[PDB]
Structure formats: structure tokens, C-alpha cells
Design a protein around this ligand. Structure first.
Ligand SMILES: [Mg+2]
Ligand SMILES: [Mg+2]
Ligand SMILES: [Zn+2]
Lengths: 95, 115
RNA sequence: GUAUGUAUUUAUUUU
RNA sequence: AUAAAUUUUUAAG
RNA sequence: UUUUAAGAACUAGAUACUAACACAUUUUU
RNA sequence: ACGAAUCUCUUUGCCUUUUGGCUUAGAUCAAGUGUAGUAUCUGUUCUUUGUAACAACUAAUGACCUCAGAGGCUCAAUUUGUUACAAUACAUUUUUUGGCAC
RNA sequence: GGAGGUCAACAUCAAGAACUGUGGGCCUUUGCCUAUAGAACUUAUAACGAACAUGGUUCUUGCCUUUUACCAGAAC
């Protein structure tokens, strides 16, 4: 079974739930948006959520200019860009 | 660290059902567990013809491919799945359906079957 | 006998 | 008038 | 600007991933 | 007239992007299974006193002065307390537990 | 100077049944013959250990898909 199963097991999670309470781990490479901006919390945190966006801005930004030729594909990817960049705007606005 | 491993060291406290609750809360926030999607390595039973580069998946070929639980449920209750496969020559996704009533597959979106 | 691989730059080097 | 007694498990592929 | 997810409580019960391994299957009605 | 040089084409020679391994041809061309290993989830409900009067208080920019950025000065309704009034009880002669109806 | 030490270093401990030194004669130092002095420790149902482990190579097997890990005999 692919490690997708093995990384999500209880014995993996529980130590993360201890590291949140005992220290400064818990990533932000895991969770998603969180959907709403104004519901985010103290600045030292949204700081990391923001880079957790800019990185994808860089990946797909590089993924723009590529000759690989799928124009419909780069169209939807282009819209995805605009969406994310708007999110970046939102995270800045909250800060 | 043996492939067949009988025991796993646990922390000295570890209320197991408590970890089931807290982990059950944790299950919502993660990106992977919630993907609604799936990835499976599989074969092509009925062969293929690509509708983009007209490439032929000749009979049965390994693929890293993607399984999805379909919102349909055959009859009152039977599961029905939809699989996707990328073409080797071009970037194109072709899909399946599994008919439980008629054992054979029926397919859509990007490929045609040879007769 | 549960592959494997690529990328993951935050702190701004003198005109 | 017979006293005759073998073994035993782990990893990797 | 836009947007709604997160927390508490309750329920009954089985399902996914892997195939590298072995495939005379034989045979009594 | 031949000697000499450049350009073009044809033939011969060289051959130029000219098959880079071994094992049972490496094995097989299936309405079919066994066996071994690893890991846990889906639904519902709930949550996200009024009026009036009196008194007190409420960051940024520019300019000037002083000291070695700080200090001072000037410039483009809300809260609290007190007082008064009104609102939040019951059936036996003057009002609302009828002496009305035909 | 005596007794000791859960102190050290350096020698020696498997062989013609076997050690070492010395005197004399022959060959030409070695070696052979003869004479003499001293021999701790270990050895005859053979050995320093009145005890008892593992490893390497090579063969023979035993388990038996293959390699580590192994089964039980031998030689070095
Ligand atoms: Mg392998
Ligand atoms: Mg091998
Ligand atoms: Zn194609």
C-alpha cells in the first residue's frame, strides 16, 4: 500500500497533536487554505499561511511559460493563478 | 524494523480511544485524506484508441491511474467506480465506468474501443 | 515483497 | 526374557 | 474584496491498498 | 596549342547518424484463483427598559522651540454617575364578572 | 633484610621421549665420536586448562525455491 496510507495513520497523527501542544511544529504543509481569511489568527501564524500560498504562486508561475502546448490546460491553470493571487491579496489585506 | 512487525512502541500513556477522537477531529483538516479522489495502478482490459494522438494502448498495459467513487450507485445499492488513465504520447485523460449489471466496462471522454 | 524520481528561497551584496 | 527415542528459527528476495 | 467553515454530542456495523510469489491442479461419486 | 586556378555534374575508392551482451527462444499469450503483507472509517442534532436635564473623559499628518529619536504647544457621537417621569395582581354596592333577555 | 600484591615487563611451555653448558679427538664453522656439570614448569588411560567455546577453507551429507542463519562427520 502506497505511503499515502502510511502517513495518515493514527500513530503518525498523534505525535503531531502532541507537538502542537508542546512546541512549534504542526507544519502548514498539511492543511489547506483555511477557506476564510478574517477567521485566521495571530500574525506569526498567518505569516506562514501566506508563504504557504506564495510557494504555489512560484510553482505554477514557472508552469506558465512552458511550451508544453496545452492551451485549454494553461487556460484553466491561468484562472487558478488569478484565484491564488487574489488569495495572496486577501492574506496581505488581513495583515 | 522488520517488514512483518508484531509490535509498535506506543507512548507510555496513549489513551487509544482518546487518540481515536482527537485523530477523528484531525482527519478533516488534512489535504490528502480529504481529496475525494484516489490513485491506483491497473490495466486496460478492452485495449483502446486515443482520440488525440490516435495512439493505441494495445491490449493490456500497466498504468498509474486514478480511481473515483461515483455518485451513482448501481440499482438500489451497488458501488460503481470511474477510472482515469493518462495517454503515453499526449497528456490526455480517459475514463471508465464499471457496469455491475453488464460485466464489461463502458468508457467515455477521450478514447474509443477497437472491434 | 509495497517502487522510484524531480521541485520545494524565508531573511533584498555597493554601479 | 526388551530395557536402542531424529527434529524445533529470523531477515532479505 | 469575497467567503464559511470550526467546535460539542450521539449511532450501527466492516472495508481499502500491494502482486514482486505460486499457479499440470490431480483425483474418489 | 598545353601548363595553372575556381565553380558545376557523373563514376570508382572511403562510408560517414550503418542493428552494443548472457541465461530454460529468458518464460508466457488465460469465463480462472490461491497465497503473503499493511492500514481504518460514513450519517444526525446543537452552537458560532425608554425619554429629558446636569457634570467628567475620549491615533495619524504638518509647523515652531529645547535636549542628545524623545518631550511640550497650536491647527483641518460614544461611555460612566446622579435626579425626575412612565411601563412591566386578581371577581361580593360607583366602572371590566353586568339585571340580561323574551 | 623478611613477608606478601586479584602489580608490571621480559623470557619459556608439545619434542629423536625429546634440554643446556663445558672438556677432548676427526673432518673442514657445521657435523660425527668421546668425557663432564646442571636440568624450573608441562606430559603415559599422554599434557600447559583434572576445564570447554567460536570462526575460515575444502570435501561428504541433512533441511530443501535462492543467500545469510543452519543440520553432523572429516582434514587442514
Ligand atoms: Mg526484487
Ligand atoms: Mg537473486
Ligand atoms: Zn494520446
Amino acid at each position: 500500500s502506497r505511503n499515502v496510507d502510511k502517513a495518515n495513520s493514527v500513530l503518525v497523527r498523534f505525535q503531531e497533536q502532541q507537538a502542537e501542544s508542546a512546541g512549534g511544529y504542526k507544519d502548514y504543509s498539511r492543511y489547506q487554505r483555511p477557506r476564510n481569511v478574517s477567521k485566521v489568527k495571530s500574525i506569526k501564524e498567518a505569516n506562514e499561511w501566506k508563504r504557504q500560498v506564495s510557494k504555489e504562486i512560484k510553482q505554477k508561475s514557472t508552469r506558465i511559460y512552458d511550451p508544453s502546448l496545452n492551451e485549454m490546460q494553461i487556460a484553466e491553470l491561468n484562472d487558478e493563478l488569478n484565484n491564488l493571487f487574489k488569495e495572496w491579496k486577501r492574506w496581505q489585506w488581513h495583515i | 524494523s522488520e517488514r512483518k512487525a508484531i509490535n509498535k512502541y506506543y507512548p507510555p500513556d496513549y489513551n487509544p480511544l482518546e487518540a481515536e477522537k482527537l485523530s477523528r477531529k484531525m482527519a478533516k483538516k488534512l489535504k490528502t485524506m480529504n481529496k475525494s479522489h484516489a490513485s491506483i495502478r491497473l490495466m486496460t482490459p478492452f485495449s483502446m484508441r486515443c482520440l488525440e494522438c490516435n495512439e493505441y494502448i494495445p491490449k493490456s498495459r500497466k498504468f498509474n491511474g486514478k480511481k473515483e467513487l461515483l455518485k451513482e450507485k448501481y440499482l438500489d445499492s451497488i458501488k460503481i467506480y470511474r477510472l482515469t488513465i493518462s495517454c503515453p504520447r499526449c497528456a490526455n485523460s480517459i475514463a471508465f465506468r464499471t457496469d455491475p449489471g453488464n460485466s464489461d466496462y463502458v468508457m467515455e471522454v477521450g478514447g474509443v474501443r477497437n472491434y
